[PDB]
Amino acid sequence: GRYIGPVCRLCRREGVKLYLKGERCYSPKCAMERRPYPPGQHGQKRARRPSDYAVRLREKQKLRRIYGISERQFRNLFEEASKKKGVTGSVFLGLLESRLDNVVYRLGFAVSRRQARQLVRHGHITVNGRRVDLPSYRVRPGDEIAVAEKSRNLELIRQNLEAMKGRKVGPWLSLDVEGMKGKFLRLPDREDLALPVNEQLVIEFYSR
Amino acid sequence: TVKELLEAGVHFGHERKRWNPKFARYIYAERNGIHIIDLQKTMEELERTFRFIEDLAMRGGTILFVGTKKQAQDIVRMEAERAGMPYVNQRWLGGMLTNFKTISQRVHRLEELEALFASPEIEERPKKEQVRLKHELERLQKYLSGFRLLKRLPDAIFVVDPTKEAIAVREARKLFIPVIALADTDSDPDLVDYIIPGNDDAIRSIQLILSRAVDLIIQARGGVVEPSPSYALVQ
Amino acid sequence: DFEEKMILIRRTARMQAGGRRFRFGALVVVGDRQGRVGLGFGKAPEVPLAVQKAGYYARRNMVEVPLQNGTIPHEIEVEFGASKIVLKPAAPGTGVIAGAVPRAILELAGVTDILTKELGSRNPINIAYATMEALRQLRTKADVERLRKG
Amino acid sequence: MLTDPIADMLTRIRNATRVYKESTDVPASRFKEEILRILAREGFIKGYERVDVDGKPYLRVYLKYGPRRQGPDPRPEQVIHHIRRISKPGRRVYVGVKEIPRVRRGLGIAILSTSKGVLTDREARKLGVGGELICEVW
RNA sequence: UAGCGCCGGCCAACUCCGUGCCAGCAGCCGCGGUAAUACGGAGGGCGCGAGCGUUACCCGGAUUCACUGGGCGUAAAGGGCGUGUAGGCGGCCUGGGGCGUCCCAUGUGAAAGACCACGGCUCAACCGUGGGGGAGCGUGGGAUACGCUCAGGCUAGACG
RNA sequence: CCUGGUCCACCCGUGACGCUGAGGCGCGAAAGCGUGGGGAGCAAACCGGAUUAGAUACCCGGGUAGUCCACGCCCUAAACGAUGCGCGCUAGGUCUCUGGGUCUCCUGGGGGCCGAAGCUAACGCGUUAAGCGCGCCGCCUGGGGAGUACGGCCGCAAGGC
Ligand SMILES: [K+]
Ligand SMILES: [K+]
Ligand SMILES: [K+]
Ligand SMILES: [K+]
Ligand SMILES: [K+]
Ligand SMILES: [K+]
Ligand SMILES: [K+]
Ligand SMILES: [Mg+2]
Ligand SMILES: [Mg+2]
Ligand SMILES: [Mg+2]
Ligand SMILES: [Mg+2]
Ligand SMILES: [Mg+2]
Ligand SMILES: [Mg+2]
Ligand SMILES: [Mg+2]
Ligand SMILES: [Mg+2]
Ligand SMILES: [Mg+2]
Ligand SMILES: [Mg+2]
Ligand SMILES: [Mg+2]
Ligand SMILES: [Mg+2]
Ligand SMILES: [Mg+2]
Ligand SMILES: [Mg+2]
Ligand SMILES: [Mg+2]
Ligand SMILES: [Mg+2]
Ligand SMILES: [Mg+2]
Ligand SMILES: [Mg+2]
Ligand SMILES: [Mg+2]
Ligand SMILES: [Mg+2]
Ligand SMILES: [Mg+2]
Ligand SMILES: [Mg+2]
Ligand SMILES: [Mg+2]
Ligand SMILES: [Mg+2]
Ligand SMILES: [Mg+2]
Ligand SMILES: [Mg+2]
Ligand SMILES: [Mg+2]
Ligand SMILES: [Mg+2]
Ligand SMILES: [Mg+2]
Ligand SMILES: [Mg+2]
Ligand SMILES: [Mg+2]
Ligand SMILES: [Mg+2]
Ligand SMILES: [Mg+2]
Ligand SMILES: [Mg+2]
Ligand SMILES: [Mg+2]
Ligand SMILES: [Mg+2]
Ligand SMILES: [Mg+2]
Ligand SMILES: [Mg+2]
Ligand SMILES: [Mg+2]
Ligand SMILES: [Mg+2]
Ligand SMILES: [Mg+2]
Ligand SMILES: [Mg+2]
Ligand SMILES: [Mg+2]
Ligand SMILES: [Mg+2]
Ligand SMILES: [Mg+2]
Ligand SMILES: [Mg+2]
Ligand SMILES: [Mg+2]
Ligand SMILES: [Mg+2]
Ligand SMILES: [Mg+2]
Ligand SMILES: [Mg+2]
Ligand SMILES: [Mg+2]
Ligand SMILES: [Mg+2]
Ligand SMILES: [Mg+2]
Ligand SMILES: [Mg+2]
Ligand SMILES: [Mg+2]
Ligand SMILES: [Mg+2]
Ligand SMILES: [Mg+2]
Ligand SMILES: [Mg+2]
Ligand SMILES: [Mg+2]
Ligand SMILES: [Mg+2]
Ligand SMILES: [Mg+2]
Ligand SMILES: [Mg+2]
Ligand SMILES: [Mg+2]
Ligand SMILES: [Mg+2]
Ligand SMILES: [Mg+2]
Ligand SMILES: [Mg+2]
Ligand SMILES: [Mg+2]
Ligand SMILES: [Mg+2]
Ligand SMILES: [Zn+2]
Structure with missing residues (x-):
């Protein structure tokens, strides 16, 4: 499924500017820089006070649509996190950030997470030398995420990594631009993520 | 402060009935079907009570005196008309403390009408108002006689009969105001924070206790005053 | 400094010759998230007055x-x-x-x-x-x- | 007669403290006295002492209360907020050492009768034995 | 290849037209008799997605058979009353036994499954290896506060 | 005349002999049934008079079973405190019945009212608990269908459980 369709309509509906196209969510064309109201005929109408279920559902949908993960995998990851020992929310975030497509996005190989998903699915990304084409692949601390030597001549990779010159990466990631590779140093802490999501709201949403 | 043996007429409590079991600790015995207060525990509690009074008085605190028993009205109306502690004489109005702002508005109207009877505006707006406002000021002075002195909530209250003035006691409890009271056998001692186990019906008991109390108050602020002119109220 | 959230708002009715007359009641909690809470139940002929009154009552009843x-x-x-x-x-x-x-x-x-x-x-x-x-x-x-x- | 003397003592203590009594007299027995020892050791009471009423021996339990509180209801806080018999006649309660309850996550006590005497939850747990769960107090 | 359900409240999602207690909807409350966010269609929206709904059944919520964890004056519920059989329950003190109770040691508790860790299919589902478990019951030894039993004693219950 | 229960005082005797109680057994207002008797007043049914739109009612005049007695059945109820029994614990005031005592009063048993703490959804309960506890029995699990059907037991029957 992947929800495939319009994306900046989610930038609008969630009320917070999402980055689903990569660029053009930074340019004054996101339709969130110019139309902050939700979509539809009744978008500009006066909003009613949302229910608690409304708030929690909206927050969970925000966090889920940020990564482009389906409801099945999302709920599975959440239950897996709740099984583990430790804070459920931070562990859930560390799991979501450990996905191979999300790591490719975070490493600047792709401008958006969906472009990263296509880069992974088409076998343009390697993990520790071996080719991996699964976005749901979980990256462990220490894994080297590289670009396939046969794909290092593609125009899109050249562009993205030519733009990554001078850009910094997340505190839990290392990047080598000449070799077109990187390393997942550790799991990201809650303070390392600047996501506009309250994890406790999602925990309470699934607590029902 | 020298009332050791002079306690003549204070030990007489109420009858066998109309008492409160919680008062049994302050009772000596029962002579001829009348509870008699324990003389020792009287001064025992008087030490602590008068000590609290001295502490609160030398700090500049205000104490509200509440008397309505018709046997202590004429006494409170002057023992508080001494050192400027306010008083309530005719009847205790519901809300004088918890609704203190509205009663203070009534006091504002009182001083407003006092100002109108001081200005030449008495003659304008003819005799109809000159009688209405006259009776209004009359009753405002009748009820808010001593209460007009309270600019803010008091720092303590003094009650002559906590059973007759139970509403004032409750209102003081609600606002965490210390409650000093001259309790008798017909009252609950737990509600009183500083108890004075004496008689509330006789005039000599009230006169003695309140005279010595106001004397201790003025002594805590220096300038010992002459004996209070409340003896002539024996009649 | 103080967060205020309403629990529920209801409309009650008393019968008078002519029809029913409505009075709104509202619960309000107030807290600093530091260890102090407060609960208040306000009643008023209209809803906003009831909410404000419940807020005042809640601030007056702290825990x-x-x-x-x-x-x-x-x-x-x-x-x-x-x-x-x-x-x-x-x-x-x-x-x-x-x-x-x-x-x-x-x-x-x-x-x-x-x-x-x-x-x-x-x-x-x-x-x-x-x-x-x-x-x-x-x-x-x-x-x-x-x-x-x- | 009394069907449960121990529960009778516990209820005497409850009813006494609920009206802020000075002391209460309970018909004397070695088991009751051994329980009162734990009580006084844990500070729920000022102590106990053997006394004699008109012909028979009793135990005066001297009750304990907090400071007098402000505002309405100046009655002091209860030192024994809750005291409940568990192993009653007709349903006796025995627990192993790994089954001793932690009362109020620590702030309470549970009185056990074990083969090594009448102990508390922490006392028995440190001793490593279980027994009859007499009563919970906190 | 993108579909299916929903948009009155519970419950996330609203307007237009048609219909006029008709045709219909509905898990519960309920909606329709002229201007329906509830019927039917449209546009729009919400939710999931190679699925989405429906029906059936089980547990859940349900502390609604209440051991944990409920009740019986007026809400469903004290028997019309007594005498008393079995049964349940049993004041104070000392001692014997150690049945209940408790403790230690030991045996048993197949594998699979469940839990944890690592590993093998590019991940996962799936699978492998290792680890940890556990009540109960058997046996040996020990404890005796309580309950039990036996022997004795006491008078506060009871009877005279 | 025969006879049951109960309370108090003395602190005399026995020495836990106690509490409750599924079954069982017995008692159980009124009405009702059987046999015999009785039968004044009352009175279902019924006979009339009124009233009424009608009046198989209320109102009025009569009147049988019955009401009464002996013996035997019947087992029901708003059989009510709509509150099972027992014991212990937890402020008091007032009225009363009945004892005892230093007889203003104290103490014990019972019948009422108001009320501490507490309880209750509230009304209210509150040492005669609906409070705090313990033991044992009975019973409840949405309303109608329905205290009906079937089965069993009991009963002469009505019918009851
Ligand atoms: K190629
Ligand atoms: K039609
Ligand atoms: K529709
Ligand atoms: K009944
Ligand atoms: K006949
Ligand atoms: K007499
Ligand atoms: K309660
Ligand atoms: Mg977790
Ligand atoms: Mg967990
Ligand atoms: Mg605190
Ligand atoms: Mg065992
Ligand atoms: Mg809604
Ligand atoms: Mg439909
Ligand atoms: Mg269904
Ligand atoms: Mg039309
Ligand atoms: Mg229309
Ligand atoms: Mg519609
Ligand atoms: Mg559509
Ligand atoms: Mg399905
Ligand atoms: Mg179900
Ligand atoms: Mg259940
Ligand atoms: Mg549950
Ligand atoms: Mg309920
Ligand atoms: Mg059910
Ligand atoms: Mg239960
Ligand atoms: Mg119930
Ligand atoms: Mg009965
Ligand atoms: Mg037996
Ligand atoms: Mg028996
Ligand atoms: Mg015994
Ligand atoms: Mg036995
Ligand atoms: Mg022994
Ligand atoms: Mg053994
Ligand atoms: Mg196994
Ligand atoms: Mg399981
Ligand atoms: Mg692997
Ligand atoms: Mg084991
Ligand atoms: Mg053994
Ligand atoms: Mg031994
Ligand atoms: Mg014996
Ligand atoms: Mg006798
Ligand atoms: Mg004797
Ligand atoms: Mg003898
Ligand atoms: Mg009996
Ligand atoms: Mg029977
Ligand atoms: Mg009968
Ligand atoms: Mg009869
Ligand atoms: Mg007959
Ligand atoms: Mg006959
Ligand atoms: Mg006649
Ligand atoms: Mg007649
Ligand atoms: Mg006729
Ligand atoms: Mg007519
Ligand atoms: Mg005619
Ligand atoms: Mg005749
Ligand atoms: Mg006949
Ligand atoms: Mg009755
Ligand atoms: Mg009854
Ligand atoms: Mg009933
Ligand atoms: Mg009773
Ligand atoms: Mg009595
Ligand atoms: Mg009453
Ligand atoms: Mg009360
Ligand atoms: Mg309740
Ligand atoms: Mg009331
Ligand atoms: Mg009782
Ligand atoms: Mg039924
Ligand atoms: Mg049914
Ligand atoms: Mg029925
Ligand atoms: Mg019947
Ligand atoms: Mg029948
Ligand atoms: Mg039949
Ligand atoms: Mg037959
Ligand atoms: Mg018939
Ligand atoms: Mg018939
Ligand atoms: Zn955008």
């Missing part, structure tokens, strides 16, 4: 909560009327698990992880009062050893 690392020091069980509230401390990373009313009250108190259960009457007013009395009946180890000095 100091002895939090111990975002949770409660010991499990409690309070009957208010026919309503029963059951509270139980939880390890961090649990979250507040409660009905709407106790969740709001505890969240404004600064609680982060706790387990609750409403029993008997589910009445929001009585459940709120039971939660308040539960928070009021909480004792710290310091308070316990203070009561047993002798």
Whole structure:
């Protein structure tokens, strides 16, 4: 499924500017820089006070649509996190950030997470030398995420990594631009993520 | 402060009935079907009570005196008309403390009408108002006689009969105001924070206790005053 | 400085010759999320006045909560009327698990992880009062050893 | 007669403290006295002492209360907020050492009768024995 | 290849037209008799997605068979009353036994499954290896506060 | 005349002999049934008079079973405190019945009212608990269908459980 369709309509509906196209969510064309109201005929109408279920559902949908993960995998990851020992929310975030497509996005190989998903699915990304084409692949601390030597001549990779010159990466990631590779140093802490999501709201949403 | 043996007429409590079991600790015995207060525990509690009074008085605190028993009205109306502690004489109005702002508005109207009877505006707006406002000021002075002195909530209250003035006691409890009271056998001692186990019906008991109390108050602020002119109220 | 959230708003009716006449009641919790909470029930002919009055009443009725690392020091069980509230401390990373009313009250108190259960009457007013009395009946180890000095 | 003397003592203490009595007399027995020892050791009471009523021996339990509180209801806080018999006649309660309950997550006590005497939850747990769960107090 | 359900409240999602207690909807409350966010269609929205709904059944919520964890004056519920059989329950003190109770040691608790860790299919589902478990019951030894039993004693219950 | 229960005082005797109680057994207002007797007043049914739109009612005049007695059945009820029994604990005031005592009063048993703490959804309960506890028995699990059907037991029958 992947929800495939319009994306900046989610930038609008969630009320917070999402980055689903990569660029053009930074340019004054996101339709969130110019139309902050939700979509539809009744978008500009006066909003009613949302229910608690409304708030929690909206927050969970925000966090889920940020990564482009389906409801099945999302709920599975959440239950897996709740099984583990430790804070459920931070562990859930560390799991979501450990996905191979999300790591490719975070490493600047792709401008958006969906472009990263296509880069992974088409076998343009390697993990520790071996080719991996699964976005749901979980990256462990220490894994080297590289670009396939046969794909290092593609125009899109050249562009993205030519733009990554001078850009910094997340505190839990290392990047080598000449070799077109990187390393997942550790799991990201809650303070390392600047996501506009309250994890406790999602925990309470699934607590029902 | 020298009332050791002079306690003549204070030990007489109420009858066998109309008492409160919680008062049994302050009772000596029962002579001829009348509870008699324990003389020792009287001064025992008087030490602590008068000590609290001295502490609160030398700090500049205000104490509200509440008397309505018709046997202590004429006494409170002057023992508080001494050192400027306010008083309530005719009847205790519901809300004088918890609704203190509205009663203070009534006091504002009182001083407003006092100002109108001081200005030449008495003659304008003819005799109809000159009688209405006259009776209004009359009753405002009748009820808010001593209460007009309270600019803010008091720092303590003094009650002559906590059973007759139970509403004032409750209102003081609600606002965490210390409650000093001259309790008798017909009252609950737990509600009183500083108890004075004496008689509330006789005039000599009230006169003695309140005279010595106001004397201790003025002594805590220096300038010992002459004996209070409340003896002539024996009649 | 003080967060204010309404629990429920209801419209009551009294009968008068001619028809029914409406009066609005509202519950309001106020908390600093530091350990102080407050519950208030306001009534007024209109809704906003009722909410404001409930806020005033709630600020006038405060409760100091002895939090111990975002949770409660010991499990409690309070009957208010026919309503029963059951509270139980939880390890961090649990979250507040409660009905709407106790969740709001505890969240404004600064609680982060706790387990609750409403029993008997589910009445929001009585459940709120039971939660308040539960928070009021909480004792710290310091308070316990203070009561047993002798 | 009394069907449960121990529960009778516990209820005497409850009813006494609920009206802020000075002391209460309970019909004397070695088991009751051994329980009262734990009580006084844990600070729920000022102590106990053997006394004699008109012909028979009793135990005066001297009760304990907190400071007088402010505002309405100045009655002091109860030192024994809750005291409940568990192993009653007709349903006796025995627990192993790994089954001893932690009362109020620590702030309370549970009185056990074990083969090594009448102990508390922490006392028995440190001794490593279980027994009859007499009553919970906090 | 993109579909299916929903948009009155519970419950996330609103307007237009048609219909006029008709045709119909509905899990519960309920909606329709002229201007329906509830019927039917449209546009729009919400939710999931190679699925989405429906029906059936089980547990859940349900503290609604209440051991944990409920009740019986007026809400369903004290028997019309007594005498008393079995049964349940049993004041104070000492001692014997150790049946209940408790403790230690030991045996048993197949594998699979469940939990944890690592590993093998590019991940996962799936699978492998290792680890940890556990009540109960058997046996040996020990404890005796309580309950039990036997022997003795006491008078506060009871009877005279 | 025969006979049951109960309370108090003395502190005399026995020495836990106690509490409750599924079954069982017995008692059980009124009405009702059987046999015999009785039968004043009352009075279902019924006979009339009124009233009424009608009046198989209320109102009025009569009147049988019955009401009464002996013996035997019947087992029901708003059989009510709509509150099972027992014991212990937890402020008092007032009225009363009945004892004892230093007889203003104290103490014990019982019948009422008001009320501390507490309880209750509230009304209310509150040492005669609906409070705090313990033991044992009975019973409840949405309303109608229905205290009906079937089965069993009991009963002469009505019918009851
Ligand atoms: K190629
Ligand atoms: K309660
Ligand atoms: K039609
Ligand atoms: K429609
Ligand atoms: K009945
Ligand atoms: K005949
Ligand atoms: K007499
Ligand atoms: Mg977790
Ligand atoms: Mg977990
Ligand atoms: Mg506190
Ligand atoms: Mg209740
Ligand atoms: Mg319910
Ligand atoms: Mg065992
Ligand atoms: Mg809605
Ligand atoms: Mg439909
Ligand atoms: Mg269904
Ligand atoms: Mg039309
Ligand atoms: Mg229309
Ligand atoms: Mg519509
Ligand atoms: Mg559509
Ligand atoms: Mg399906
Ligand atoms: Mg179900
Ligand atoms: Mg259940
Ligand atoms: Mg449950
Ligand atoms: Mg059911
Ligand atoms: Mg139960
Ligand atoms: Mg129930
Ligand atoms: Mg009965
Ligand atoms: Mg037997
Ligand atoms: Mg027997
Ligand atoms: Mg025994
Ligand atoms: Mg036995
Ligand atoms: Mg022995
Ligand atoms: Mg053994
Ligand atoms: Mg196994
Ligand atoms: Mg399981
Ligand atoms: Mg692997
Ligand atoms: Mg084992
Ligand atoms: Mg053995
Ligand atoms: Mg031995
Ligand atoms: Mg014997
Ligand atoms: Mg006798
Ligand atoms: Mg004798
Ligand atoms: Mg003898
Ligand atoms: Mg009996
Ligand atoms: Mg029977
Ligand atoms: Mg009969
Ligand atoms: Mg008869
Ligand atoms: Mg006959
Ligand atoms: Mg005959
Ligand atoms: Mg006649
Ligand atoms: Mg007639
Ligand atoms: Mg006729
Ligand atoms: Mg007619
Ligand atoms: Mg005619
Ligand atoms: Mg005749
Ligand atoms: Mg006949
Ligand atoms: Mg009756
Ligand atoms: Mg009855
Ligand atoms: Mg009933
Ligand atoms: Mg009774
Ligand atoms: Mg009596
Ligand atoms: Mg009463
Ligand atoms: Mg009360
Ligand atoms: Mg009332
Ligand atoms: Mg009772
Ligand atoms: Mg039925
Ligand atoms: Mg049914
Ligand atoms: Mg029926
Ligand atoms: Mg019948
Ligand atoms: Mg029948
Ligand atoms: Mg039949
Ligand atoms: Mg037959
Ligand atoms: Mg018939
Ligand atoms: Mg018939
Ligand atoms: Zn965008």
